[PDB]
Symmetry: C4
Subunit: 407 residues, 4 copies
């Protein structure tokens, strides 16, 4: 069996971040850190599943808290976002659990599909798969941490500044008063306690991490697939000005077909996650864009809002672009295959060219749409249309303006 | 001739529900229960056609009643739905009559097209065609019965609760007073009578059954076609890792071509029904979605509205997905055909792959659109756009709020 | 040379209606009635061109009259339609003149392209080209005459009924007073005279005929092309269950390629007319649809408005469907070519199937769009979206209601 | 080495206008006027880069002036256009700098790709590349000069007429007072001085030239590519009725593949410029179209507004059409290749036909969209939808009307 310890495999590239997600109980798999992907298994009776149940119970508690609070104070389009967040997070857990159920098979096939690309005539690119995954995942994680830190800083500064410059009822600033005020949707259902306060903070952080990790996981999977497609493209490019025997084209076509089979399997496994991430990203992007013209009190509020909006748009665009890189890489070999000489042309090259030309090699949202650059352009156009139609809805709200600080 | 009694044929699978629809005079065919599909014929002078004429006359009476009532009280976008319902139902009858005219030919060809798939190398899947049709049809019928029961319960409870808690003019609750009130659009044209009351109730039930049976029939036909396409895909999958002679590919391509010819014939026969069902579903889904934010008096009213909306959306999505399963199954064999070895590759495999790749194997609405997953995604996007643009139209109505119970 | 007198050619089919259009100076060609299409020529110094100049001068006079009248009374979205009409008509003349410039070449090639289809193995369908053109053109002409008659009747009845039931200033009804009132946009610039009145009526009738003849001419051309494509499809169908030699496929492919070349040439010639007709139809359909909810005084006003709206929508749909029948007929032979036996399969069948599959055989609006069923569906969706967005613009106008009859 | 002095090459065709753009420091390349394209190089330490830095510093000064002025007076959707202009211009500089970085490689490959087309069997068309580029560039430059002259004339006439017919506070017209008034967004940050006034006028002219030169450069590049594609199409047409040896098709396919490689390279180089130009054109076209119904004081104001709107729409349409001419020319050879005889048909013709049919030979905006006639039609439809939705936003502004002249 191959030595998985040092090989440049997808599982080795992604298992650190899969374990980081496990820490917040995202995808409950057993032995995700094992070097051999064959040792990855899904077990309902396991510590990861127990932590997942705990986190899902707590997220359900938070979702019920938000639902009851909004019912008490009435549901508004602006309030609803909160519920949606928790809803999405809960959905994510369920989706990821199902994904975990399918992950072993997937990872197994993935490994056995990518062993041929770890040996000649395929070479490791300048940026190996582990480095690509690390760079993208660290960027996403750092940006999400910055977004949540800005959220917390904006909330705390708004609360403290309101109290300080209120020049009216004081309610001296404190951790407990802030916890009861900003998170009143929770403590209006559960008795307040500092331990519960820290728990709610940690659980909100975990929910935010899950919310970002849906997109992060889609990104890592897209990198893993486009890496092998790029290796195939590079191998084909190496045949640019050479007479190529039929056997070379046979092997290239077989490897491309295996890569497409792996893409189909992974797409079937991940279609639910892709659909959930796409719908959640669209909703949140539209909601934040509808608030671009709103007026906020403090400069920190503007900083947080614009950082969140830009980060969300960039994360959506980056996930879509990373997923579409699979399609772009699949099509990139067509230009080199079209240069095959008349002497080297054979039935195998014709078959491969036909498959590259007519097959859509891309991740899909349950085959309702395919993650391509054209899809990202259409999503941008749809978002623009929705924003144009919706900015009329909130025009009265926009002209309401900032409320009095004292009130 | 083949023994139709026990064979796993489409006609055997669907004739129970076709006869159930005949009971409400949907598709007036003679000998629909006959085991031999060759004995199915369309006759204008027949009991099914007489019942169809009676039901169409009664539906025309109801439609005229609604038209005159709305003219008397003025036509509003909210009132119009009622007329549309009856209109659609009447259209359905006409469409189905035409479909009946074409059904014998269709069924005949269908039978002779599916005889090859009842013998090796094709095997019956885990869920045979009869079981698939039964499951889907029973689900649709039960959900429609639940929807109509909730409609009746909501109307009756609203009427009775209004009268009881009116604390004003009493008009003690009774069957006759409810019949005159809720169905005043009928009795404002016809003299009231309990027999006419029961007749109107039964006729409204029949109209609802027709309204749901358009989608149900499209679903059963889609199941019948995708069943044979799935059998072809399974047979191709059985050739995954074997050297295949040219004769096997010849037979596979011929069976696929026959299946596509059957799909073309059935699509030509059913294009009118598909178009009518699509337009009716779109209109009703948009109309119900425009009322999501409206305020209803009783919890039963909310239960009925949301059950109806969710059932309608799910029925539209399920019909579209079942129809698109034909296209998905047709394309599913391409992946296996792309794995054919260089030794087994021949002109027949190339022909079949070209046909699967470039031909759109799907039901269509008169070729204006094709029932695919992409079409369902586009329909969802179009519905979202229409709802966004239309929620401004009814904003004044939404802010009107609930009327006084006494008034 | 072939005997053009009795042959079933496009020129013989369409020249009666081309001459009818010449009577109103639409397409100024010389010798359009000649049996030999080679005798058709375009001459600037000719009676048709003189009549075209006279009609264009008259239409410019009417357009200037409308422009000055609207400037005097201010331009409104409702008034603008009038100007647009004349503008379109003027554009049509120019376009048709250019079309006339290209018609001889076109007709010549057309004739020499369709001679092979007048002899075996091609047979004349049940409805020959002359009968198809006659039926469609007579339907369009009769419906346009009915539309204009309803327009005149509605205007005259509105005027006379207003005067009669005014119960105020009388201005006894007369031809001259009606001419000065309804056509005040003309006589406000030119001194009134009964001769000028009859001239304005005749010139308005000619403008209406041109407005309808753009669509009519597109329809006849589409019939001419789809006729030969249908003949090709029928010839291919005749090879359904026969072993076919390579020569038969060679001839079929050559005839199909010649038909596609003729379609390309005709599309290049007629792209301007197609674009103008499409834009004019879209504008007028949207404008009329925006007035569906408006309230009109008399039942004749409703009759005229709804006849005009239904006729316009039906004419647009029929032109689009007739043009798309070319594409449908081109694709109809693919199903029969896919049934070719393995023994009869050759490079010629593969070439023909590839061309039918991948080539878009359809008329186009300068290649910006192609006249297909999908395009008609997209046009319907675009019209629905535009109407939804625009019904908000005229909501104040809709709630204005009918003006007082006396005022 | 080939004699570049007299050859009909792209670099010879475009270098005069590239140098004209260099005069305003658009694309800082060294030796752009050199007859040998191999002598074109990009150097940060060079006079072109120094002038580019000066112009970018000036444009940043103007952008900061506009930003501070709008902050002082509040940002409105109408004011924002100004900022956008400068922003785009600044972006253009950056983009063009990057383009300059890539230009040498590009031009080099371009030259070596187009040497084969300067010799038989390719002939120079009636309009050689230099003449096509000269005509289009002179048209664009003259129209831009007219647009800016109309802008300046409208501003000056509005200012002078206001002062003269004010009949109130006079502030006798002068160059300095006009400079301080119309360009108050500048002098509100920098102390006024006539030298600074002339500098601001010249720098605004340079910014306008850059704004138009983005589209102009895209146009010239599109002409350069479609020229060679048209030469290929003409060479193929020359084989219309001849038996063609396999070697001729080999050479034609190789030249077509080289042209497609050049298109891919140029598209990769110019995708940023195409995206920026497309977004800027869309924004400005929508903004100007939103002001069509606004009321302006003087006839010169209407003349300037409509000249600017028509010129902008025509420039967008012309850039899109010139870019799509590459795709149209690539597809134009398919019709002639489909006429190849059965005797001359070979694997090379099949390969070439497959590539022309299935490959999208067009410039693209980073592969998010492709510059085709269909894309221009979709852009027109999107603009219409945006204008319909947006005309509701500015309806209050439209009904505000013209402000008092004295105020
Ligand atoms: O809207 C994006 C933000 O979502 C989360 O914020 C939660 C918050 O944690 C929770 O207390 C409240 O009930 O709902 C919001 C979302 O509506 C993230 O914590 C933020 O970083 C995001 O900006
Ligand atoms: O709107 C969906 C409902 O359609 C039917 O309800 C009819 C009703 O039977 C009839 O009396 C009235 O005139 O019109 C409505 C439809 O507008 C079904 O009976 C209901 O189950 C559906 O919910
Ligand atoms: O709007 C469709 C109608 O167009 C013509 O009507 C003209 C009319 O002849 C002319 O006097 C007036 O100035 O403008 C209208 C069009 O705006 C046709 O004559 C009518 O048949 C059409 O209904
Ligand atoms: O809007 C198109 C116009 O853009 C430029 O005009 C500038 C102007 O030079 C500058 O002083 C001002 O600050 O902004 C506008 C653009 O918003 C061109 O100079 C004009 O020719 C164009 O019409």
């Amino acid at each position: 069996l191959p030595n998985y310890t040092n090989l440049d495999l997808f599982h080795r590239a992604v298992f650190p971040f899969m374990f980081l997600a496990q820490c917040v109980a995202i995808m409950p798999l057993v032995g995700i850190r094992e070097s051999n992907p064959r040792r990855v298994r899904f077990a309902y009776k396991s510590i990861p599943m127990f932590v997942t149940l705990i986190f899902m119970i707590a997220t359900s508690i938070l979702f019920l808290s938000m639902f009851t609070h909004l019912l008490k104070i009435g549901i508004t389009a602006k309030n609803f976002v909160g519920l949606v967040f928790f809803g999405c997070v809960l959905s994510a857990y369920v989706v990821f659990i199902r994904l975990a159920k399918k992950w072993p098979a997937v990872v197994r096939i993935w490994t056995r599909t990518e062993i041929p690309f770890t040996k000649p005539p395929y070479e490791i690119p300048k940026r190996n798969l582990s480095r690509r995954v690390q760079l993208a995942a660290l960027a996403i994680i750092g940006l999400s941490l910055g977004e949540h830190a800005l959220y917390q800083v904006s909330a705390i500064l708004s609360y403290t500044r309101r109290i300080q410059m209120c020049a009216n009822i004081t309610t001296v600033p404190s951790f407990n008063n802030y916890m009861q005020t900003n998170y009143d949707y929770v403590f209006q259902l559960l008795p307040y306690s500092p331990i519960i306060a820290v728990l709610i903070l940690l659980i909100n952080g975990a929910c935010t991490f899950v919310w970002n990790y849906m997109d992060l996981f889609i990104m890592m999977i897209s990198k893993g697939l486009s890496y092998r497609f790029e290796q195939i493209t590079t191998r084909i490019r190496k045949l640019e000005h050479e007479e190529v025997c039929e056997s070379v084209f046979i092997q290239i076509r077989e490897h491309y077909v295996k890569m497409c089979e792996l893409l189909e399997f992974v797409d079937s496994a991940m279609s639910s996650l892709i659909l959930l991430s796409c719908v959640n990203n669209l909703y949140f992007v539209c909601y934040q864009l509808l608030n671009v013209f709103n007026k906020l009190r403090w400069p920190i509020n503007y900083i947080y809002f614009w950082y969140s909006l830009l980060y969300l748009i960039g994360r959506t665009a980056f996930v879509f672009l990373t997923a579409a890189d699979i399609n772009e890489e699949s099509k990139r070999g067509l230009g080199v295959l079209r240069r095959v000489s008349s002497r080297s042309w054979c039935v195998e090259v014709e078959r491969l060219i036909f498959q590259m030309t007519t097959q859509t090699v891309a991740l899909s949202g349950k085959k309702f749409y395919f993650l391509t650059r054209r899809l990202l352009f259409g999503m941008a156009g749809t978002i623009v249309t929705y924003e144009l139609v919706l900015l009329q809805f909130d025009e009265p709200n926009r002209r309401k303006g900032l409320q009095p600080l004292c009130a």
